[PDB]
From Swiss-Prot, chain A:
Gene Ontology process terms (BP): proteasome-mediated ubiquitin-dependent protein catabolic process; ubiquitin-dependent protein catabolic process
Residues of the full protein shown: 170 to 308 of 338
Molecular-function GO term, any one: metallopeptidase activity
Function (record text): Acts as a regulatory subunit of the 26S proteasome which is involved in the ATP-dependent degradation of ubiquitinated proteins.
Residue stretches spanning the membrane: none
Protein name: 26S proteasome regulatory subunit RPN8
Organism: Saccharomyces cerevisiae (strain ATCC 204508 / S288c)
Gene from which this protein is expressed: RPN8
Keyword Metal-binding: no
Swiss-Prot record, chain B:
Locations listed in the record: Nucleus
Protein name listed in UniProt: 26S proteasome regulatory subunit RPN7
Annotated TPR repeat ranges: 109-142
One family name in Pfam for this protein: RPN7_PSMD6_C
Organismal lineage: Eukaryota, Fungi, Dikarya, Ascomycota, Saccharomycotina
Superkingdom to which the source organism belongs: Eukaryota
Miscellaneous information on this protein: Present with 51900 molecules/cell in log phase SD medium.
Keyword field: Nucleus, Phosphoprotein, Proteasome, TPR repeat
The species this protein was found in: Saccharomyces cerevisiae (strain ATCC 204508 / S288c)
Any GO MF annotation of the entry: structural molecule activity
GO BP term, pick one: ubiquitin-dependent protein catabolic process
Any GO CC annotation of this UniProt entry: proteasome regulatory particle, lid subcomplex
Length: 98, 400
C-alpha cells in the first residue's frame, strides 16, 4: 500500500552533521547554566579523526585491492560493449541485404 | 629414418668429437644408396652451406671433417632414378587396376596411400602432400586418416615445418569426437611435444615428454633414447623439486636407462647434483652433458649455450634459499668456484631481476634479497594490462 500511494554516503554525511550540532548546543548551554553522563561518554569518543592516521599505512593495503578489482571490472565491460558493436554490425549487414 | 636425420645433423656443425663425423658420413652414403631417395644426396650441398666443420671439399679448403667429399654426381643420381621409374611402373599397374575396379572407398584411397609412401620415399615434399590430401577424403574411418598425418609429420621433422604440420596435427585431434583412442593420443602427445621443443614452450614439454605412456619407440621418426634425452633437459625447467623425486629420479622408465645407454648420463649426474644442491659436482657435469647431448641433438644445438645459462640459473636459486649472509671465499674452497669470475657469472641475472643475490664488495660477502612480495607480482599485471589495452584501441578504431 505504500508503493501505491507513492507510485548513499551523501545522505549519511548530512546525518552526521545533525548529531554534531546537538553536542555543540549542549556544551554552550551548559556553560551558561554553570559559569554528568554526557561528559563521561564524550571523552571516550576522542580517544577511540586524528587517531585514524596511525593505521593509514595499513589502510592503503586493502584500498588498492579495490582498484585492482575495478581494473578487471572495467576490462570486462569492454567485452559487453564490443560484442554489442559486433552485434550491431551484423544488423547493418542484414538491412543492406534486405 | 631417425639415424638418417641424426647423422646428417652431425655433419653440419660439430665442435666436439670430430670422430663421430666419420661414422655419420659413412652411414649417410650407404643409406642413400640402399634407399630410393634421389634428392637427399643432392641436398648435402645446400644444407651445409656456411657452417663450421664443413663436410664438402670443392672450393673450400677449411673443411675439418674426416670425409670431405659429399659432392653430388650423375653416377649415383641416374641409378636412383632407375629404381624410382621401375617402382612407379608397378604401382601405376596396380592403380590402373584399382581405377577400373573401384571397390569401396578403401581401395580408392589405398591407391593414394601407396603413392603417399612412394612420393615420400622418392624425395618429394609438396608432391607428396598433394597425394595425401586425396587419400584423406577417401578414408572410410579415422584409421586411414591418421596414417596421412604420419607422412606429414615425417616430411615436417626433416624440413622443420611448423605451419602445415601443426595445422594437420590438431585437425586429426579435433575431428568430431576425440575419445581415448591410442593412436590419436600416444602419437599426438609425442609429435606435439616435438613441436613444443623448437618453439620452447616448456609448459607442455614437461608433461608430454618426461611423462610418456610407455616407450613410444616407433623407430621411424624418433627413438627410445631420444625421448628420454629431451626429458632430462626439459624436466629441469617446469618440473620443480617435488616432481624431480617422483617422475625423474624415481621414474621406473629411467631406472633401466642407466644400465642400458651410458652415453647420455643426463638422468644421473645432472639429477643427483641438483637434488643434493652441490655446486662442486654440478659444475664439471655441465660441459660433459653439453658435448654429448645438446650438440648431437638437432633441436638442442640450435640454442646450446643458452641452456647453460638457464641450467646454471637453477642451481644459483637452490643455494640462495639455503643462507642469508655468506662469504665469497667459503664457496670457493668448498664448491670450487672462482671469486674473480663469480661477479661476471652472476652479472647476467641480478641486474635483469632473475636472481635476488646481493654481494657486498667491501667485505666480500653475499646477501639475500626478498624473493617474493606483493609489489613484484603486480608488475606482471601492468605489462599484461597495458598490452591488452593496445588491442582494444587498435581493433576498436579499425572497425568504424
Amino acid at each position: 500500500g505504500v508503493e501505491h500511494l507513492l507510485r548513499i554516503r551523501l545522505t549519511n554525511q548530512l546525518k552526521s552533521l545533525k548529531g554534531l550540532q546537538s553536542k555543540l548546543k549542549d556544551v554552550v548551554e551548559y556553560l551558561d547554566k554553570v559559569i554528568h553522563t554526557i561528559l563521561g561518554k564524550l571523552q571516550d569518543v576522542f580517544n577511540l579523526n586524528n587517531l585514524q592516521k596511525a593505521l593509514t599505512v595499513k589502510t592503503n593495503d586493502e584500498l588498492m585491492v579495490i582498484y585492482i578489482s575495478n581494473l578487471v571490472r572495467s576490462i570486462i565491460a569492454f567485452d559487453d560493449l564490443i560484442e554489442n558493436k559486433i552485434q550491431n554490425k551484423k544488423i547493418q549487414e542484414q538491412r543492406v541485404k534486405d | 629414418n631417425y639415424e638418417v636425420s641424426e647423422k646428417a645433423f652431425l655433419l653440419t656443425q660439430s665442435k666436439v668429437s670430430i670422430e663421430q663425423r666419420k661414422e655419420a658420413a659413412e652411414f649417410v652414403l650407404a643409406k642413400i644408396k640402399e634407399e630410393e631417395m634421389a634428392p637427399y644426396y643432392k641436398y648435402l650441398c645446400e644444407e651445409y652451406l656456411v657452417n663450421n666443420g664443413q663436410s664438402d671439399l670443392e672450393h673450400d679448403e677449411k673443411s675439418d671433417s674426416l670425409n670431405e667429399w659429399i659432392k653430388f654426381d650423375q653416377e649415383l643420381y641416374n641409378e636412383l632414378c632407375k629404381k624410382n621409374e621401375s617402382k612407379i611402373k608397378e604401382l601405376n599397374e596396380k592403380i590402373q587396376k584399382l581405377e577400373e575396379d573401384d571397390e569401396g572407398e578403401l581401395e580408392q584411397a589405398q591407391a593414394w596411400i601407396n603413392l603417399g609412401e612412394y612420393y615420400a620415399q622418392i624425395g618429394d615434399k609438396d608432391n607428396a602432400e598433394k597425394t595425401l590430401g586425396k587419400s584423406l577424403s577417401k578414408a572410410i574411418s579415422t584409421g586411414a586418416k591418421i596414417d596421412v598425418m604420419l607422412t606429414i609429420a615425417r616430411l615436417g621433422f626433416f624440413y622443420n615445418d611448423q605451419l602445415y604440420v601443426k595445422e594437420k596435427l590438431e585437425a586429426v585431434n579435433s575431428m568430431i569426437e576425440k575419445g581415448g583412442d591410442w593412436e590419436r593420443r600416444n602419437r599426438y602427445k609425442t609429435y606435439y611435444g616435438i613441436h613444443c621443443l623448437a618453439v620452447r614452450n616448456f609448459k607442455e614439454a614437461a608433461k608430454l615428454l618426461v611423462d610418456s605412456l610407455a616407450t613410444f619407440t616407433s623407430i621411424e621418426l624418433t627413438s627410445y633414447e631420444s625421448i628420454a634425452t629431451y626429458a632430462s633437459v626439459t624436466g629441469l625447467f617446469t618440473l620443480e623439486r617435488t616432481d624431480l623425486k617422483s617422475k625423474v629420479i624415481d621414474s621406473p622408465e629411467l631406472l633401466s636407462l642407466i644400465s642400458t645407454t651410458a652415453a647420455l648420463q643426463s638422468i644421473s649426474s645432472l639429477t643427483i647434483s641438483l637434488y643434493a644442491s652441490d655446486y662442486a659436482s654440478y659444475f664439471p657435469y655441465l660441459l660433459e652433458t653439453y658435448a654429448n647431448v645438446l650438440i648431437p641433438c638437432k633441436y638442442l644445438n640450435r640454442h646450446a649455450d643458452f641452456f647453460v645459462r638457464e641450467m646454471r640459473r637453477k642451481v644459483y636459486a637452490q643455494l640462495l634459499e639455503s643462507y642469508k649472509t655468506l662469504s665469497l671465499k667459503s664457496m670457493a674452497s668448498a664448491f670450487g668456484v672462482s671469486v674473480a669470475f663469480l661477479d661476471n657469472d652472476l652479472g647476467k641475472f641480478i641486474p635483469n631481476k632473475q636472481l635476488n643475490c646481493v654481494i657486498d664488495r667491501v667485505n666480500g660477502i653475499v646477501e639475500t634479497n626478498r624473493p617474493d612480495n606483493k609489489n613484484a607480482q603486480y608488475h606482471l599485471l601492468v605489462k599484461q594490462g597495458d598490452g591488452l589495452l593496445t588491442k582494444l584501441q587498435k581493433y576498436g578504431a579499425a572497425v568504424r
